């Protein structure tokens, strides 16, 4: 019985691989050959946002490209005014083992989580003039590695129980559960339309989910080690994955296989965070070697280096308006690059 | 700067003051991490995340355990890792030894010391003296090993030698391992962690200075 099912699975996998192999007529590297190279970009730090007394594990911009929230091991979220370096809010946390950090698009809420397996939503714009928990979202069996806000009432969380979940914050219960990963889901990017989302796990597989129907539409597997970061291209038809293999790869949703590999002979360290620009031409990647690299997304060449951290770059973010990049390292500082 | 902006700056400075206050209060305590597979007596050494307080000689200690291949990265700033082994169950002692090899050689613990406790050394005596079980059945190197009751002692030094031998292989001196034979009724376990922590903090102090 099980032998027949496994044989059918092997036939299905061979059919998938043959289906993709027919579509790969001409490589993106060949098509991208005759465009103007971006040259060197020299983005210097403009701000340094000190005040954290531990390693920064996550951060997230606001929708207005003006505010951002950062979580560290001192058990505190700090909401920064990036324009003036002012601290707008300091939110103490019940558990100091935070791994993720989310800012709601409306800006009324923030979310953090980690080894305590609970997503916590904080009400920022309240009477009484303080920040307080509105809801603790329990139900994951493992640690939370990412969480992104669909809206004020919906949030999606990736976890180390091999499962992603979607919640109704008002009711505080798992509306839909996304299952199919075999390793720990490490990164979770939400699509610009908030109808699909792509997740990267420790099994070197990236999976595409439909938020509504709760189904794994496509599975992408090219990496050799765990995927640590994942981010949609602004178009919404592609995404970039960074892994511990010291490699970033660009996957297309419609072609349904890898497009480009961003690797260099020197890089040996794992990739910690991936972000795009507004136009999608640059691919900011945070590395374990305590600096970031700017890859030309189309031509696959290091266009620059962001070297200002004396410990590993753990997070990375780019504003909606595209003015500034943020990097946060285990050195307790986060810098705004332009 | 406008009046609004000046007042916001004042608020930020107050947040800053509270942040250093919390940082000092946090620095006054030492962070640990308790590891061990199961059936090892983890919870009885000092008698999703379970945190336990305890203080010896007016030093705040704060252990954590979980209920590992990826989240160990969080515990890279811990003072020491406490690894626990059940030394009375030789059926799965090699699993424990491989686990120690994994934690010892992990990339993010290259400067983190490990404190070994070999629990149920009170049952190791019974198992060895009874004669029902035999180390040489599992570990061949036992019958050709002699210590540098007698044979229970030689056995328990054999296990310790295995663990310290994995420790020495690639320590490079940046971090070391501290073995301790312990029981369930043994009380002097916070004192062992205290003394080992003094040793580790001495190494760290001598290392911020580029000396050790």
């Amino acid at each position, epitope marked *: 019985e099980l032998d027949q099912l496994r044989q059918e699975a092997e036939q299905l996998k061979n059919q998938i691989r043959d289906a993709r192999k027919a579509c790969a007529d001409a490589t993106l590297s060949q098509i991208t050959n005759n465009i103007d190279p971006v040259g060197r970009i020299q983005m210097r730090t403009r701000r340094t946002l000190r005040g954290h007394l531990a390693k920064i594990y996550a951060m997230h911009w606001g929708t207005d490209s*003006r*505010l951002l929230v950062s979580a560290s091991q001192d058990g505190k979220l700090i909401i920064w*005014d990036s*324009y003036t370096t*002012n601290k*707008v*809010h300091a939110i103490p946390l019940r558990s100091s083992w935070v791994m993720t950090c989310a800012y709601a698009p409306s800006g009324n809420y923030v979310a953090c989580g980690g080894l305590d397996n609970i997503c916590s939503i904080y009400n920022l*714009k309240t*009477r*009484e*003039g*303080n920040v307080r928990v509105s809801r603790e979202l329990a139900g994951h069996t493992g640690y939370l590695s990412c969480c992104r806000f669909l809206d004020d009432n919906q949030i999606v969380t990736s976890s180390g129980d091999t499962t992603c979940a979607l919640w109704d914050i008002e009711t505080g219960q798992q509306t839909t559960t996304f299952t199919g990963h075999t390793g720990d889901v490490m990164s979770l990017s939400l699509a610009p339309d908030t109808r699909l989302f792509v997740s990267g796990a420790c099994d070197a597989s990236a999976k595409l989910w439909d938020v509504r129907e709760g189904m794994c539409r496509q599975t992408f597997t090219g990496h050799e080690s765990d995927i640590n970061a994942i981010c949609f291209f602004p178009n919404g038809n592609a995404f970039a994955t960074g892994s511990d293999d010291a490699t970033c790869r660009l996957f297309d949703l419609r072609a349904d296989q890898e497009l480009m590999t961003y690797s260099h002979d020197n890089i040996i360290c794992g990739i910690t965070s991936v972000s795009f620009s507004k136009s999608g031409r640059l691919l900011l990647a945070g590395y374990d070697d305590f600096n970031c690299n700017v890859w030309d997304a189309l031509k696959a060449d290091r266009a620059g280096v962001l070297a200002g951290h004396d410990n590993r770059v753990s997070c990375l973010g780019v504003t909606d308006d595209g003015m500034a990049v943020a990097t946060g390292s285990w050195d307790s500082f986060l810098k705004i690059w332009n | 700067v*406008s*009046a*609004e*902006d000046k*007042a*916001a700056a*004042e*608020r930020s400075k*107050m947040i800053d003051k509270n942040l250093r206050e919390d940082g000092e209060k946090a620095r006054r305590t030492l962070r640990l991490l308790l590891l061990g597979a199961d059936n090892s007596g983890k919870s009885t050494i000092v008698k999703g995340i379970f945190e336990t307080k305890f203080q010896v000689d007016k030093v705040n200690f704060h252990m954590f355990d979980v209920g590992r291949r990826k989240w160990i990265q969080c515990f890279n700033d811990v003072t020491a890792i406490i690894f626990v082994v059940d030394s009375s169950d030789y059926n799965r002692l090699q699993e424990a030894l491989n686990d120690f090899k994994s934690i010892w050689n992990n990339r993010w613990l290259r400067t983190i010391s490990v404190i070994l406790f070999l629990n149920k050394q009170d049952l190791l005596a019974e198992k060895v003296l009874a004669g029902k079980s035999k180390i040489e059945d599992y570990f061949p190197e036992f019958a050709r090993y002699t210590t540098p009751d007698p044979r229970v002692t030689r056995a328990k030094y054999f296990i310790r030698k295995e663990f310290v031998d994995i420790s020495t292989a690639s320590g490079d001196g940046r971090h070391i391992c501290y073995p301790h034979f312990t029981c369930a009724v043994d009380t002097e376990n916070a004192r062992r962690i205290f003394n080992d922590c003094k040793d580790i903090i001495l190494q760290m102090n001598l290392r911020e200075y580029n000396l050790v």
Partner: single-chain antibody
Amino acid sequence: VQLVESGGGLVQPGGSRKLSCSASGFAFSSFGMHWVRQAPEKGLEWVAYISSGSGTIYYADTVKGRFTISRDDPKNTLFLQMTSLRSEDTAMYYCVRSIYYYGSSPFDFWGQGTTLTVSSDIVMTQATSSVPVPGESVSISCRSSKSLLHSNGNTYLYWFLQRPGQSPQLLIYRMSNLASGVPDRFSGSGSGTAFTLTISRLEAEDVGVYYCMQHLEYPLTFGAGTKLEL
């Protein structure tokens, strides 16, 4: 949220009194507190200012030297000690909370004041002292001595509604933003030294005196007041 003021009474000229504001229902230590008085038949006038953490103190020129403002954070109490009281100090002293971070809403909650009876600076102009006008639309204007537009893109104009026999209520902060609870019919617009506050579908419980306050720099100055009567 509740600011309940105390003190008050008939005071002989030259005497001294202390007014006490008792906060309840909000994080009082993280709020900067103002004192604003209103003469029996006049507009609103700023008096004092205690900052969060009591770091910064600002007084009005009229009360500079003979007034003292201080807060007791553990007791959640705000104080106004004032000696050498004069016949120009007869007013209902309102206690005001204000918090200052990015995107905040200062001057959002006012207390029920206590009446005390004693037996350069930017000028705000609100010309239409009384506009007679239900279900229609009205516009209320305000002017300034200097452009209230700061270099950081913020135009610091505020709007207040004083319902009859009630403490004034914030409507608009920074000439565009509606407060927490005001109906969406209100809206403010304007430029430097040119301001307006338009209302649509004017209703009941909606008529009073509309004050425009500047917050560009101290001392904070109000308008005379535009009144809407049905």
